[PDB]
Design a protein around this motif. Sequence first.
Motif, PDB file in Angstrom:
ATOM      1  N   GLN A  19       0.919  -1.151   0.131  1.00  0.00           N
ATOM      2  CA  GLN A  19      -0.196   0.151   0.105  1.00  0.00           C
ATOM      3  C   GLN A  19       0.711   1.208  -0.004  1.00  0.00           C
ATOM      4  OE1 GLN A  19      -0.214  -2.460   2.474  1.00  0.00           O
ATOM      5  NE2 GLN A  19      -2.187  -3.391   1.761  1.00  0.00           N
ATOM      6  N   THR A  20       0.434   2.156  -0.559  1.00  0.00           N
ATOM      7  CA  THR A  20       0.923   3.645  -0.441  1.00  0.00           C
ATOM      8  C   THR A  20       0.649   4.320   0.926  1.00  0.00           C
ATOM      9  OG1 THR A  20       0.923   4.085  -2.637  1.00  0.00           O
ATOM     10  CG2 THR A  20       0.762   5.941  -1.197  1.00  0.00           C
ATOM     11  N   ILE A  21       1.534   4.664   1.598  1.00  0.00           N
ATOM     12  CA  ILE A  21       1.010   5.347   3.034  1.00  0.00           C
ATOM     13  C   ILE A  21       1.059   6.890   2.964  1.00  0.00           C
ATOM     14  CG2 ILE A  21       2.003   3.142   3.962  1.00  0.00           C
ATOM     15  CD1 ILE A  21       4.647   4.620   4.695  1.00  0.00           C
ATOM     16  N   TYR A  22       0.448   7.279   3.908  1.00  0.00           N
ATOM     17  CA  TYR A  22       0.260   8.609   4.343  1.00  0.00           C
ATOM     18  C   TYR A  22       1.318   9.112   5.320  1.00  0.00           C
ATOM     19  CZ  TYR A  22      -1.636  12.749   6.752  1.00  0.00           C
ATOM     20  OH  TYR A  22      -1.587  13.971   7.475  1.00  0.00           O
ATOM     21  N   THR A  23       2.195   9.874   5.083  1.00  0.00           N
ATOM     22  CA  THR A  23       3.272  10.188   6.160  1.00  0.00           C
ATOM     23  C   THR A  23       2.959  11.647   6.616  1.00  0.00           C
ATOM     24  OG1 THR A  23       5.047   8.963   4.798  1.00  0.00           O
ATOM     25  CG2 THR A  23       5.686  10.733   6.538  1.00  0.00           C
ATOM     26  N   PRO A  24       2.173  11.756   7.972  1.00  0.00           N
ATOM     27  CA  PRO A  24       2.133  13.097   8.254  1.00  0.00           C
ATOM     28  C   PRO A  24       3.151  13.857   8.316  1.00  0.00           C
ATOM     29  CG  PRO A  24       0.994  11.537   9.572  1.00  0.00           C
ATOM     30  CD  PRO A  24       1.797  10.537   8.556  1.00  0.00           C
ATOM     31  N   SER A  25       4.222  13.593   8.839  1.00  0.00           N
ATOM     32  CA  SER A  25       5.639  14.460   9.161  1.00  0.00           C
ATOM     33  C   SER A  25       5.936  15.011   7.946  1.00  0.00           C
ATOM     34  CB  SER A  25       6.511  13.555   9.665  1.00  0.00           C
ATOM     35  OG  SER A  25       6.899  12.609   8.636  1.00  0.00           O
ATOM     36  N   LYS A  26       5.466  14.732   6.685  1.00  0.00           N
ATOM     37  CA  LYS A  26       5.913  15.314   5.499  1.00  0.00           C
ATOM     38  C   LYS A  26       4.831  16.255   4.861  1.00  0.00           C
ATOM     39  N   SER A  27       3.832  16.400   5.697  1.00  0.00           N
ATOM     40  CA  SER A  27       2.882  17.343   5.428  1.00  0.00           C
ATOM     41  C   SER A  27       2.990  18.608   6.266  1.00  0.00           C
ATOM     42  CB  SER A  27       1.473  16.631   5.459  1.00  0.00           C
ATOM     43  OG  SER A  27       0.314  17.582   5.098  1.00  0.00           O
ATOM     44  N   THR A  28       3.109  19.587   5.725  1.00  0.00           N
ATOM     45  CA  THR A  28       3.096  20.936   6.428  1.00  0.00           C
ATOM     46  C   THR A  28       1.681  21.359   6.810  1.00  0.00           C
ATOM     47  OG1 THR A  28       3.112  22.179   4.157  1.00  0.00           O
ATOM     48  CG2 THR A  28       5.418  21.557   4.987  1.00  0.00           C
ATOM     49  N   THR A  29       0.811  20.770   6.419  1.00  0.00           N
ATOM     50  CA  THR A  29      -0.526  21.202   6.958  1.00  0.00           C
ATOM     51  C   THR A  29      -1.111  20.064   7.794  1.00  0.00           C
ATOM     52  OG1 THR A  29      -1.264  20.432   4.619  1.00  0.00           O
ATOM     53  CG2 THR A  29      -1.435  22.786   5.181  1.00  0.00           C
ATOM     54  N   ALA A  30      -0.453  19.082   8.287  1.00  0.00           N
ATOM     55  CA  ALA A  30      -0.919  17.934   9.045  1.00  0.00           C
ATOM     56  C   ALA A  30      -0.743  18.449  10.737  1.00  0.00           C
ATOM     57  CB  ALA A  30      -0.193  16.686   8.785  1.00  0.00           C
ATOM     58  N   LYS A  31      -1.814  18.205  11.361  1.00  0.00           N
ATOM     59  CA  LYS A  31      -1.768  18.459  12.843  1.00  0.00           C
ATOM     60  C   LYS A  31      -2.410  17.383  13.460  1.00  0.00           C
ATOM     61  N   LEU A  32      -1.609  16.884  14.479  1.00  0.00           N
ATOM     62  CA  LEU A  32      -2.036  15.886  15.287  1.00  0.00           C
ATOM     63  C   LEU A  32      -3.491  16.433  16.052  1.00  0.00           C
ATOM     64  CD1 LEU A  32      -1.609  12.894  16.736  1.00  0.00           C
ATOM     65  CD2 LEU A  32      -0.733  14.278  18.535  1.00  0.00           C
ATOM     66  N   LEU A  33      -4.547  15.457  15.855  1.00  0.00           N
ATOM     67  CA  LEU A  33      -5.607  15.798  16.744  1.00  0.00           C
ATOM     68  C   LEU A  33      -5.337  15.190  17.946  1.00  0.00           C
ATOM     69  CD1 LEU A  33      -8.819  16.811  16.696  1.00  0.00           C
ATOM     70  CD2 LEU A  33      -9.234  15.117  15.825  1.00  0.00           C
ATOM     71  N   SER A  34      -5.096  16.030  19.036  1.00  0.00           N
ATOM     72  CA  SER A  34      -4.640  15.424  20.212  1.00  0.00           C
ATOM     73  C   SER A  34      -5.486  14.867  21.115  1.00  0.00           C
ATOM     74  CB  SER A  34      -4.129  16.915  21.226  1.00  0.00           C
ATOM     75  OG  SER A  34      -3.406  16.257  22.407  1.00  0.00           O
ATOM     76  N   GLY A  35      -5.217  13.621  21.526  1.00  0.00           N
ATOM     77  CA  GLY A  35      -5.926  12.749  22.450  1.00  0.00           C
ATOM     78  C   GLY A  35      -7.036  11.632  21.564  1.00  0.00           C
ATOM     79  N   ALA A  36      -7.191  12.142  20.302  1.00  0.00           N
ATOM     80  CA  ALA A  36      -8.381  11.435  19.630  1.00  0.00           C
ATOM     81  C   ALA A  36      -7.578   9.996  18.795  1.00  0.00           C
ATOM     82  CB  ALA A  36      -8.526  12.197  18.238  1.00  0.00           C
ATOM     83  N   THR A  37      -8.741   8.952  19.307  1.00  0.00           N
ATOM     84  CA  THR A  37      -8.105   7.764  18.506  1.00  0.00           C
ATOM     85  C   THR A  37      -9.420   7.230  17.676  1.00  0.00           C
ATOM     86  OG1 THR A  37      -8.956   6.706  20.682  1.00  0.00           O
ATOM     87  CG2 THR A  37      -6.777   7.127  20.542  1.00  0.00           C
ATOM     88  N   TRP A  38      -9.218   6.143  17.012  1.00  0.00           N
ATOM     89  CA  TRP A  38     -10.340   5.593  16.306  1.00  0.00           C
ATOM     90  C   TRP A  38     -10.359   3.994  16.053  1.00  0.00           C
ATOM     91  CZ3 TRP A  38      -9.438   2.878  11.528  1.00  0.00           C
ATOM     92  CH2 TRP A  38      -8.000   3.273  11.166  1.00  0.00           C
ATOM     93  N   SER A  39     -11.309   3.370  16.109  1.00  0.00           N
ATOM     94  CA  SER A  39     -11.280   1.783  16.095  1.00  0.00           C
ATOM     95  C   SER A  39     -12.619   1.554  15.582  1.00  0.00           C
ATOM     96  CB  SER A  39     -11.129   1.123  17.242  1.00  0.00           C
ATOM     97  OG  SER A  39     -10.976  -0.198  17.139  1.00  0.00           O
TER      98      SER A  39
END
Length: 330
Positions: free
Chosen positions: A56-76
Amino acid sequence: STGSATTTPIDSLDDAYITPVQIGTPAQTLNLDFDTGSSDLWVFSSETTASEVDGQTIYTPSKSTTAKLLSGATWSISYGDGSSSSGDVYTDTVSVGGLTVTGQAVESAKKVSSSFTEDSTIDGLLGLAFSTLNTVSPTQQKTFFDNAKASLDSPVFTADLGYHAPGTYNFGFIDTTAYTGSITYTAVSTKQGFWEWTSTGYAVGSGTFKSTSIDGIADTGTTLLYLPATVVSAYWAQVSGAKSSSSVGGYVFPCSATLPSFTFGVGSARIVIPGDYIDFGPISTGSSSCFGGIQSSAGIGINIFGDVALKAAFVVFNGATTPTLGFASK
């Protein structure tokens, strides 16, 4: 605004459809499974367990200048087929076919089940059910469509899936060249979070139409058509040698057969699924036993108008204050 993207079957059976999606800055293009039966946009990522990534092709958030961690959020999430995934969440810019949403929740997989790992062609899902089903905790997040809706020329998206061929997802407009006759609109219940509607009945091949209410969901993320056991039995009875196999997991039929069409009702209108659409090929390589594209919903808990049904039509997902569904032949 509007958007328009081509969606492409992942294999020769139309087992699923992938649509390119631009995530982040600079764009990272991932091929996602647009799923009107769920409401999470999740991707394979740089955070995914290495052993669980295989092509698969992966998303790398660290390489995106517009990516922001949504603090504390998880999903399942777990899907009806038993597959699952989970991780954490970023917000980033997401574009589909020229339509851009800023601050879209992009759910980054830390874990995926084997069925996702084993499918190298699908980089993630883009949910298009109602945001009430979104799994992000503790703050539920909105779908791409939900985020874009207000900016769209019209609060709609449409699904035009191809048979053994590419199709189109449009956002914000109805392409009047993409279907024949008129679009018949039908009521939707959002109470289960799905595009849930009631078909007015069915016919098998050239047989008479049976008027009967069939409640189900329009689900681009399910391959097959899942209907009540009475309906499904009536269909396969018209195929010599067809049988339900518990060992295989549904109706199988001789690959030498010619399948009859299946018609389903949308109000007073009729959508015809050609017999060819219902053939999902040998159960195993080289087998003369073929898998049916119409299967029983008994034990699922809901009827599912999956790709087998939807690809026979031009389908409008109308997200007006009171949502509705529209079907046209094409």
